[PDB]
């Protein structure tokens, strides 16, 4: 429960927008820095942060392409930025890079990886907690540009530090702060290019519970798709109000509980928090059970692997009224379901 304890994707990292017919995650140099400052927390705090000892939540907008409960490991996804090329007359004057002819940013395919420059523990992780938010960040390649920005050589924080580290890491290919010809130039705008991203989750034989993150922006939301691979455990999943790409690969004796309380009612967002409205009358009209598929409302759950008596019965659950927990018990084998109240 406590779908209210969990923040909305983008609360910390920021939500990208369209300002001039272009996706822009940040628009002021100062503010760009803070984002990096934010990104850097994966080193400082770790991959996962704990909400109240109970819920493991990945860092906001941290691209994770794999969670493996067998290895206790994760794999980071693509987080790159456009490389520079062709400075002339470079010096280091007063800790600030100087140039006669300023370097040019370019979209040409060799891109620099931000994540590579990061020191993160992605192995021997502590995934003991039963409660875990699924990642909310798709693969991206940041465009950017600089602009003449006086008086920001004073700027120093975990953000400027990471930015500096990227410069040093990719010698003569990245300069976020520099003086050229007349005045000081700084990266002013972060312009992401999100990409289709399949997050893979390899499950152990334990009991695990997953909350789909609430991602309001539709565009970003639909770049993601989760692929679960069960191995004979007990798996719980709270769907968001949003129809998300979910594929479940079935192992022998896989028991799946899918909370659909966000599917069967209208859900809105009021003060940057979920707001559960009234149950859709004739919600069962929207329920379609096909061979290796559950369609409820417009949400889709695809199924792969061996379907039999050990793993064919998946339990969709929500609350028909305040104090009535209903279970839609779907039989994948016979494309039939039934209705209980416990």
């Amino acid at each position, epitope marked *: 429960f406590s779908i209210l304890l969990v923040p909305l994707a983008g609360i910390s990292a920021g*939500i990208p927008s369209l300002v001039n017919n272009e996706l822009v995650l940040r628009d002021k140099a100062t503010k760009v820095v803070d984002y990096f400052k934010h990104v850097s927390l994966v080193e400082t705090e770790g991959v996962f942060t704990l909400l109240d000892d109970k819920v493991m939540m990945p860092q906001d907008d941290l691209v994770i392409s794999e969670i493996d409960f067998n290895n206790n490991s994760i794999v980071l996804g693509k987080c790159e930025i456009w490389r520079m090329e062709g400075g002339s007359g470079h010096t280091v004057t007063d800790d600030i890079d100087h140039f006669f002819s300023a370097p040019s940013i370019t979209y040409r395919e060799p891109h620099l990886s931000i994540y590579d420059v990061l020191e993160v523990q992605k192995e021997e992780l502590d995934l003991s907690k039963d409660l875990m938010v699924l990642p909310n960040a798709p693969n991206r390649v940041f465009a950017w540009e600089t602009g003449w920005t006086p008086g920001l050589r004073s700027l120093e924080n975990d953000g400027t530090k990471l930015l500096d580290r990227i410069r040093d890491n990719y010698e003569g290919e990245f300069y976020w702060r520099y003086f050229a010809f007349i005045a000081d130039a700084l990266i002013t705008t972060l312009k992401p290019r999100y990409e289709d991203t399949n997050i893979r989750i390899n499950l152990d034989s334990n009991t695990r519970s997953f909350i789909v993150p609430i991602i309001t922006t539709e565009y970003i939301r639909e770049k993601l798709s989760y692929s679960f691979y069960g191995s004979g455990g007990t798996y719980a999943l709270s769907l968001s109000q949003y129809n998300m790409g979910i594929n479940i690969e079935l192992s022998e004796s896989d028991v799946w509980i899918i909370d659909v309380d966000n599917v069967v009612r*209208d859900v*809105t967002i009021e003060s940057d928090k979920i707001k559960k409205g009234d149950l859709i009358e004739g919600i069962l009209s929207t329920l379609s059970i096909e061979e290796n598929k559950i369609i409820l409302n417009s949400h889709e759950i695809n199924f792969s692997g061996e379907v039999n008596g050990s793993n064919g019965f998946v339990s969709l659950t929500f609350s028909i009224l305040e104090g009535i927990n209903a279970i839609i018990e779907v039989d994948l084998l016979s494309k039939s379901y039934k209705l209980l109240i416990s």
Partner: nanobody, 128 residues
Framework: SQVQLVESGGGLVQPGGSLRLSCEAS????????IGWFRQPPGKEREAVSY????????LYADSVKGRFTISRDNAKNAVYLQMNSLKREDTAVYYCARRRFSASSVNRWLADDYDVWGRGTQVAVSS
């Protein structure tokens, strides 16, 4: 005049017929925006018809047109399409194309406050 959503292809057909509506999205990049189709029958409210999300993955139709209408979009050629089949007389309306705001955090997806650009509509009448 920059950002527009011009619809075309409306006219007259006879019950059980079919036609195809066109939306020439102009003056922005609709690879980001989700597009909807709405309609207003004579003397009635504006009505939800179909709604394609940016990138497919969310093709929704109103119960009145399920099975009959089919929605499609060519981001590349910046146009959305609605193929209409088995046209009944109840389908007589003024059909509109509209772009869903990029930031719409509502599952309704037809809320009409979540839409920023609206076309002029094309009328469809159905009578033999």
């Amino acid at each position: 005049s920059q950002v527009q959503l011009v619809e075309s292809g409306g006219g007259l057909v006879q019950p059980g017929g079919s036609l195809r509506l066109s939306c020439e999205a102009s003056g922005f990049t609709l690879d980001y925006y989700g597009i909807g189709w709405f309609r207003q029958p004579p003397g009635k409210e504006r009505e939800a018809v179909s709604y394609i999300s940016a990138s497919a993955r969310t093709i929704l139709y109103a119960d009145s047109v399920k099975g009959r209408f089919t929605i499609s979009r060519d981001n590349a050629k910046n146009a959305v399409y609605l193929q209409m089949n088995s046209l009944k007389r109840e389908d007589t309306a003024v059909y509109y194309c509209a772009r869903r705001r990029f930031s719409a955090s509502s599952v309704n997806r037809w809320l009409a406050d979540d839409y920023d650009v609206w076309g002029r509509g094309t009328q469809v009448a159905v009578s033999s």
